[model samples]
Target: ARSYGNGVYCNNKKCWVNRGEATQSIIGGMISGWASGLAGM
Candidate 1:
């Protein structure tokens, strides 16, 4: 696996792809929101 500033990438026999910045941001937002909700609990 390789990591960028805002995301990660992996390449294998079955997959080759990059998530890029926007996708990373979206995923980060979702996780952050989930964590905030958990903290409220």
Candidate 2:
């Protein structure tokens, strides 16, 4: 994967062939995980 921003991947150029479509579907269920963690401020 083309690494970007340290942890971010911007291999859009290579994946645009079919990955763009795959992204929409994969990103759908990922939101819940990120929001579930916090410092409990």
Candidate 3:
């Protein structure tokens, strides 16, 4: 039997940074969450 866990994984590499997809996805989601939380305040 095998088990799998679900979570977000990010790779920090020059290639990923060059494409900007990884940073955009992660930082964008973080900012969105922060903004949503502040909306109620």
Candidate 4:
């Protein structure tokens, strides 16, 4: 939730974190895997 003075942005209305969570999870996993692979080298 966030506020811009004009109005309050609720997750129920914005839903920004809904899809981002899954996308971020996949990206984070890929980055971790790559870093681990580099460390092994």
Candidate 5:
């Protein structure tokens, strides 16, 4: 479930951490790019 603002909704048991869209997107992009570069190697 998403909230009213920009962020991710965590529904894990005993844990709920909502990360903002900017941070999430940046991290996601970095990871994907890194993985792609590694795969190309």
Candidate 6:
């Protein structure tokens, strides 16, 4: 279980992709879904 956790807030990702780790988080995951959702819009 190598979740990125709150590290993105500690780190950075311009465009998040499934990096194998998939490191989904409460904050990061929410953004990924929202970002990817609005990313096309």
Local accuracy by lDDT, each model = 0.53, 0.42, 0.44, 0.53, 0.53, 0.54
User: 1-41, model 6: which lDDT tens digit per residue?
Assistant: 24466443334446544433554544466567668999868
Q: How accurate is candidate 3 locally (lDDT)?
A: 0.44
For model 6 the local lDDT of residue 28 reads 68
* Clash count, one per candidate: 0, 0, 0, 0, 0, 1
Model 5: CA > 4 A from native: 1-23
Total residue pair clashes for candidate 5: 0
lDDT for model 1, please: 0.53
Model 6 regions lying over 4 Å from their true place:
1-27
Candidate with better TM-score, 3 vs 6: 3
Where does the lowest 10-residue lDDT sum fall in candidate 1? 14-23
In candidate 5, what are the lDDT values of residues 1-41, reduced to their tens digit? Answer: 66665334544444334344423875564456569899979
For candidate 2, report its TM-score. Answer: 0.22
For candidate 1, report its TM-score.
Answer: 0.33
Estimate, for each residue in 1-41, the C-alpha lDDT of model 3 and write its tens digit.
Answer: 22232222334331122224533776565466479899958
Better of 3 and 6 by lDDT: 6
The lowest-lDDT stretch of 10 consecutive residues in candidate 4 is 14-23
Q: Which stretches of candidate 4 lie over 4 Å from their true place?
A: 1-23
Report the C-alpha lDDT of model 1 over 1-41, residue by residue, as the tens digit: 66564334544444433444433876565456579899979
**Model 5 C-alpha lDDT versus the unseen true structure:** 0.53
Better of 2 and 5 by TM-score: 5
Candidate 5 displacement at residue 33 in angstroms? 0.6
Deviation (Å) of 7 in candidate 6: 24
- Candidate 4: deviation at residue 6, Å? 42
Cα lDDT tens digits, model 4, 1-41, are 46653333534654333333433886564466579899969
Colliding pairs, model 4: none
